């Protein structure tokens, strides 16, 4: 049943080209250059954060089809991340579509385009994270006007995604935030009802395998001592969050299994001053390498979802779409625009990696 079992994970050429064309020519030390080349071979998700990235999904699946007709057993890894009024509680968003300006119809076309590409590659197992930073806002952030207004659109758009991508070669994991968002005990029951109702309102799609946690975040999977910025949450790591949340979803008829983003959680505690500081956090490392061998039946895989070295946001307050979280003193600076290559952050992650690359 675990879609990560029986397959390898494809390491995509987009990330490899950032490492090889942008990063390695800036590194003089031979050991760090070799470490960088190895990091580019660790398979991370490719983000489809605009419609103009959908050709990248098709090219990636064409590369996988060639590899698999030549003996590979690779699965593709993609993030679906283009809701209208995206990131409704954030101080800045890069989403291209607006609910008030045709955004729901534009989302429909974006999902329609992805469905035809996944059908075009119905021979290729396709592992999707659906919409980071979306439904979790409807549990805690309804007091933010943009999120109160976006409820209907987010729920209809997510229903369209999980129904239209319900294909025999797909496994989807809905983003469900992280322990410091939905793992607080007061958020668990409302979160479980919301996410189980999404599953049931979509007619319990076979491809909707479960939920993704820690995406673009830094929490430990398991740590013996709670980091101080987690107090007083008893669910201070992803393992305790998932162990508390999974049986509540199952109680409501969604027997969800999980994947956990371990791409930036290898150094613990992090440099965070507060748990809600998410941008370009200092003091982090690459974490556990992608695997289906998690030791935990709730957890299908540890994965690298956010790609290390791609910025979370610009720190220039005069730049477009500046988010003040990216200028906090626990955010590494200067940082380029979201998604752009951030060399000093890539070096940070490589040097602090656990397991090590050096």
Curated annotation (Swiss-Prot):
Example GO molecular function: cellulose 1,4-beta-cellobiosidase activity
Residue numbers annotated as active site: 133
Glycosylation positions in this chain: 201
Post-translational changes noted in the entry: Asn-201 was primarily unglycosylated with a small fraction (18%) bearing a single GlcNAc at this site.
GO biological process: cellulose catabolic process
Species of provenance: Hypocrea jecorina (Trichoderma reesei)
Function, in words: Exocellobiohydrolases (CBH) that catalyzes the hydrolysis of 1,4-beta-D-glucosidic bonds in cellulose to release the disaccharide cellobiose. The degradation of cellulose involves an interplay between different cellulolytic enzymes. Hydrolysis starts with endoglucanases (EGs), which cut internal beta-1,4-glucosidic bonds in cellulose to reduce the polymerization degree of the substrate and create new chain ends for exocellobiohydrolases (CBHs). The CBHs release the disaccharide cellobiose from the non-reducing end of the cellulose polymer chain.
Protein name: Exoglucanase 2
Chain positions covered by the region annotation Catalytic: 46-358
Keyword Signal assigned: yes
Gene name as annotated: cbh2
Domain writeup: The enzyme consists of two functional domains, a catalytic core joined to a carbohydrate-binding domain (CBM) by a serine-, threonine-, and proline-rich, highly glycosylated linker sequence.
UniProt record similarity statement: Belongs to the glycosyl hydrolase 6 (cellulase B) family.
Transition state stabilizer that also modulates the pKa of Asp-245 and may act as a proton acceptor through a water chain (site feature) positions: 87
Documented effect of changing residue 133 to A: No measurable activity
Whole-protein residues included: 158 to 471 of 471
Hydrolase found in the keyword field: yes
